[PDB]
């Protein structure tokens, strides 16, 4: 049943009573007090002076408990003949010896246990417990260097063939085991009892019985060993009840009611580790990059700034059309690290190396693309810097700026916007402490650089460049255009959603080894989902087709999904763009993968057999070179 | 008890029973059936073909229905001796005689009456129960005009005094009676039935038999009388138990929990109805008044803009520096109305009368502030406008504006806020269906007015002009300037704080009677709260003071707190200031109530009973009028 004993004081309390129940120990069983347990293996000591005589409580076992800790007890009892030896565990556990039965209430709190009163209810103190599990796991420690002993042996040369049987002379294959074994091993030191500790686990090692001139069969697993037995027909029983699990527990993982949800969904239950995203800011088409800012270009005019850091060093730096700043609102705080190392930024009279560079926050409530003079930026900070290298490369003539690692991280704590009206701006550009000529440096910033992009929120996610406080999975289906997606954010739905879809990407195919356009389980809940959409009453010019053209089109398109996930968002793709085919998409993996019966498709069945045949072959093939290379007489 | 009659089924059910019960009907029960009532009072009909011959469910009444239901009757045999003049209700209804004692299970649900069984039940049928009510309303409607003319009979003269007793000979009164009642009046025709009618509800007027010769009192009420009469030395108990109700009902209507809360609480919950404020936008300092944008000074430029209104009609208005607008941001929706009676904006090449003014909303980007061209005011409409009247005023040779009801409401929901650096401002200013000389006219804006904010809200509340979601009442204590507070919106935290504490401020005077510089059950809380503040050491100077110091400065800045409710918002109040004092006075209204054992003031009770007997004295002496100018022969 489980849970703890208990022990009625109220003598007239039935159900739902104040005080009728509690709780059972050892005074109320003076069995179940440890000076009774019995010192086989000596584990209590036996001189009295040391011995507590306090009580201690008792709690109930379960049937698969007491499955369980027996069955722990024999990974001791294979190497037996090796224990004796090291003279350790003379008496073997047996855990039962250390139960015992009361007819008394069970439960956990008593109001459950007012009710159950059972029959022969295994008890037991936690001090004999924890007498118990240490004793398995003190000879499991004692055996150690014993165990490696017996794999090396059993992996030095095939023990297990997948399929069928084989045969090599005995004389021949210990021969060859003798020269490759270490030689510290204890196969060296104790030959005849690992022979037999081999036996008990492998029904093909024999050892013949030199009294009665007899040999037999004797390892001990022989039940489990036939789940993992091909047939004459079909793979083993064991992993063709694996494999289906998994698939389940991946599905399960997918949580497929998420992403088919027709409705608003918040965003942290949706939100997925996310992964790093890298760029190049120059290079972006602007009308894309929704959450990037540009002071215009093309006006001639040209200025200076003077904006301290945290110690207050007071700087210079330029600020002229085309420059580009991101626009740190709503930019799901987030990570940068901007790489300038690679480029030449060399001037017919500005050299890049020496210089510095460093990031740049604004506050400014004009908008930034106003700017137009030193006045209205308002507030300032410089919160990171480096000095620059430079390095001539393969291009023969010119020099190049080594590795940088320009760091910082956006968080919204410190910045603390409460402003309704205010702005934010994040800049990478030269910075000095004397002034710059305007025209002695003509960059219009330092974006011109590799930007790795990395996310700080994982419990936030922007969509289309714009954070969200809920997102709706059903809508992203079929309206993304990869000019844009390149231009997402690391933290985008797609990408939490892309890899999350993948994800029951790789079910399909651990169930489906469908070859191309035919059906599938899993390939057909499109073709239903196709059909009905071709009936009805619409715009366009409708076409009827035969099933015979239906059915592939559903596989054609099903093996796009495995071979990329990231196209069913990807603006209108052939099938997987409509949200109808995305759904019975995302149902019948959950159903066809919850009626499959211990089976494996057709064209696995055929071929895991041949394929294991081969092996054996290969098998005998190895050990017909034992025989040649090492006879016997 | 109460709810329903439940019959049994099963006979063999104990608890969780299904459906061992059933919802018992007049028909088991055929004594509570239409053909077995009493017909007293004659209402059911008395011919077998017109009746219903259908069941009905029944109910259970309970002991207060039973008290009040009869006790409703006799407030109709007040007036026995009409209404048999009239021949009409000859047999009292006797509310008991329609109901029938039985035993079942009776309860609301079946599960609950399940084990709840009862004795001698009054049942009764709907139509049972609302046929009684009908004989008895019914008669109420025939007292219609009866009862008026009894009461002009005792109102007309003083019939009952505050205390002790009066006289006036009999025939006197009658006689002054005869010579002021209308002539239509009932006791006209029926001088003996109000006689008596009279004698019933008042012990002093009793009329002397001429058989027996003798008279004794009359009135059927003299216990209810003696609640209503005041002690030879206090007041009336009624009054009192009524005083304190009052005061105890103010302040669970103004929950003082939320405005002692020290933490955040929710808006909505907190607010309550607001009342329309006004401000006069031309007046108001730039700075306080955080709602308001303007444009600079010195800028020398004017410019006009072309806006256009729902109907499509286009209109041309002019701006320079100085012409305020408001920010419709964070403003919890209002109604701006507005008004320009009183006002000249006559001008040396500009005669207002004729012309046309508006409210213009304007939608950008682009701060109010740094505007100054034609290209940058975004999207705009004349969202309403109105025609000018003038008329000549006190001041001669110079004409005035008459009235003008300019009014818009703000709703965000129309605004459609999709974009966290728009921008919406509202302007009102002249508006002119051609273009306008900027010159002839120089009015920055015509905000020189009497503008009425009007709430549209309730849930939403604003502070310190900008709306939060989340108040804290601890902390708007000594936080508003004299000044702020005239800068705020209507639909403000401290108008909410304020109109709230009044009636905590309300409660008090009904039962505190304190006076000029001495102490009070209410005023004390402060004074606790003072002693221990003064005596762990602060900052500066520690200063001591004797308790008799203390006593008085409570009971002052309390008897500040009642003459001005507002006193506490302010900023540097001399002793409200601080939470602590508003706190410790906020719990200690509860208690000073609910801890009274009905009792009242001293010096009042002193007053209540020196006033009444001046008031008995004043009625004798009007009675004297009588006897002198109606003598009795
Ligand atoms: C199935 C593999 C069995 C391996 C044979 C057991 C250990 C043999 C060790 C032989 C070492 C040299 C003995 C000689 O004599
Ligand atoms: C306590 C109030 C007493 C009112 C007396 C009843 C009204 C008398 C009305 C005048 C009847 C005059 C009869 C003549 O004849």
Redesign the interface.
Known sequence: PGGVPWIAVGDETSVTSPGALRRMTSKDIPETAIINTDNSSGAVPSESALVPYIDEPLVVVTEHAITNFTKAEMALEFNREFLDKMRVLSVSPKYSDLLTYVDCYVGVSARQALNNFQKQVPVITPTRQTMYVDSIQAALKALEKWEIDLRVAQTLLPTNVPIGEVSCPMQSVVKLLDDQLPDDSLIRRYPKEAAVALAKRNGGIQWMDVSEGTVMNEAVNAVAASALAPSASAPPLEEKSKLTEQAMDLVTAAEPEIIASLVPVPAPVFAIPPKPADYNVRTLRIDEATWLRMIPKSMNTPFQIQVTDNTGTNWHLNLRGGTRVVNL??IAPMRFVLDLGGKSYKETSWDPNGKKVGFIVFQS???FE?WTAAS?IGQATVVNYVQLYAEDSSFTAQSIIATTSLAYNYEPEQLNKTD??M?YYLLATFIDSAAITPTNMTQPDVWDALLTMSPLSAGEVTVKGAVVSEVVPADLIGSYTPESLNTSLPNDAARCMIDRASKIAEAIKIDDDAGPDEYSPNSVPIQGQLAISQLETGYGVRIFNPKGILSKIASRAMQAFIGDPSTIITQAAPVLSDKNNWIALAQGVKTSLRTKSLSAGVKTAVSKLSSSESIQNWTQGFLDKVSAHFPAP
């Open positions: 609102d709503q409530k004009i908008p106003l209205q309704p009206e702005n």
